[PDB]
Amino acid sequence: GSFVEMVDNLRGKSGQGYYVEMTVGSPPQTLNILVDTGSSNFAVGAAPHPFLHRYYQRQLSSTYRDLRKGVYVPYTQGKWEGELGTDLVSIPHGPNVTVRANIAAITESDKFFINGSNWEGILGLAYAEIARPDDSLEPFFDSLVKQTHVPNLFSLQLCGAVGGSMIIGGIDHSLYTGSLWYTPIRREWYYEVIIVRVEINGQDLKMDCKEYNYDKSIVDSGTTNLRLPKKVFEAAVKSIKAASSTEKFPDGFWLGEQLVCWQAGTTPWNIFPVISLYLMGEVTNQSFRITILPQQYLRPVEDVATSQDDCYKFAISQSSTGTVMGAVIMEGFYVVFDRARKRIGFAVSACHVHDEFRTAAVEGPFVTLDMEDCGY
Numbered sequence: 001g002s003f004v005e006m007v008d009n010l011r012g013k014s015g016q017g018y019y020v021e022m023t024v025g026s027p028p029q030t031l032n033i034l035v036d037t038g039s040s041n042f043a044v045g046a047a048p049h050p051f052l053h054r055y056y057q058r059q060l061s062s063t064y065r066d067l068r069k070g071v072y073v074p075y076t077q078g079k080w081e082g083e084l085g086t087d088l089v090s091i092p093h094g095p096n097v098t099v100r101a102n103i104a105a106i107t108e109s110d111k112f113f114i115n116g117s118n119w120e121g122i123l124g125l126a127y128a129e130i131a132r133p134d135d136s137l138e139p140f141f142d143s144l145v146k147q148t149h150v151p152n153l154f155s156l157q158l159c160g161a162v163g164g165s166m167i168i169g170g171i172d173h174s175l176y177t178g179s180l181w182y183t184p185i186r187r188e189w190y191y192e193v194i195i196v197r198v199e200i201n202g203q204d205l206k207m208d209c210k211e212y213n214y215d216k217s218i219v220d221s222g223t224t225n226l227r228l229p230k231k232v233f234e235a236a237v238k239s240i241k242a243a244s245s246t247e248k249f250p251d252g253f254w255l256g257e258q259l260v261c262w263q264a265g266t267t268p269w270n271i272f273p274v275i276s277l278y279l280m281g282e283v284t285n286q287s288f289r290i291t292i293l294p295q296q297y298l299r300p301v302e303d304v305a306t307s308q309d310d311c312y313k314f315a316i317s318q319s320s321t322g323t324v325m326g327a328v329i330m331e332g333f334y335v336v337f338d339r340a341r342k343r344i345g346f347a348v349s350a351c352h353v354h355d356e357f358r359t360a361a362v363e364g365p366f367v368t369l370d371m372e373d374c375g376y
């Protein structure tokens with residue numbers, strides 16, 4: 001189970017996440033599982049559902065153990081309920097290991113599963129602090145490290161059109177170019193980070209840096225968009241509108257609700273600005289920036305019916321729960337979740353976004369002598 005054998009182990013559909021193949025139980029039941037750095041439960045469909053092609057059948061697994069504990073998770077956009085237990089788990093295109101792990105067998109859900117996503121469960125890769133029902137439910141990755149010699153790190157290379165790679169236990173140098181820049185993990189719950197500066201087409205938003213991290217900033221492969229706190233979102237939209245003024249779009253487009261379409265191959269990329277997110281470096285008042293092109297923040301919506309054109313959703317949205325550097329931000333970068341060193345690394349990946357004029361980039365270092373602490 002070498003890193004080369006882990007390459008291209010992810011698949012996905014635009015706006016529906018990225019999934020990896022896993023097996024649960026004995027004999028192994030194959031399931032596609034969403035790779036989620038924004039949550040901490042291993043939760044799998046375990047009962048028929050109109051959007052499930054397959055589900056975990058506990059009665060067919062002779063290694064299943066019921067923990068006699070239920071779990072009820074109402075969340076902002078939906079809900080899932082289930083039963084806790086443990087069973088044997090493997091990642092066929094991951095490390096060459098089998099571990100016993102906690103599994104929440106989802107028995108009922110609302111707005112959780114997606115029509116045609118091709119995934120049947122979620123692999124929450126964040127820390128025990130946000131596990132449900134509480135922190136005593138050991139997350140999968142923690143179990144994996146405890147039971148094997150797998151180093152305490154994984155990396156994600158998410159690619160747009162989807163596919164990509166999840167490298168467990170290491171860094172695959174063939175999936176990135178240039179330097180890998182590290183930002184500290186501020187607290188071990190979500191993958192919390194600090195944004196110290198935001199520019200739109202090189203123009204600083206000029207806010208107190210605490211505004212960018214109101215109330216936390218996270219790296220979440222389980223959220224599609226770049227989600228920004230109200231104040232930040234409003235200033236970002238004003239700036240992107242000023243840059244793209246040669247064309248006027250409905251308020252619906254800016255709300256992330258409606259499509260913007262152009263005749264196939266004519267998307268005016270040049271009228272949309274680049275977004276620079278400056279992340280806190282490993283040393284005092286040093287930072288580095290990741291640059292986000294419109295090829296990332298204008299998410300393409302595949303639909304045979306609209307296929308005479310190239311249609312997109314605006315993949316930046318308002319948040320009341322802090323900044324979320326979602327899938328559209330991670331795409332085109334090689335993101336290293338260095339749990340062992342409490343840091344997240346960013347580098348330009350092989351599948352980075354670019355055109356004839358501009359490219360996604362990871363640049364540093366930048367120094368800021370006039371710096372307060374940017375954390376909330």
Ligand SMILES: COc1ccc([C@]2(c3cccc(-c4cncnc4)c3)N=C(N)c3nc(C)sc32)cc1
Pocket residue numbers: 015016017018034036037038039040041043073075076077112113122124132220221222223224
């Ligand atoms: C332990 O309980 C939970 C586990 C995961 C989720 C969740 C999620 C849930 C279902 C589908 C997705 C998803 C949908 N579309 C695209 N990507 C991921 C995300 N994963 C996230 N990162 C996330 N963020 C939300 C605001 S909901 C949600 C919510 C609850």
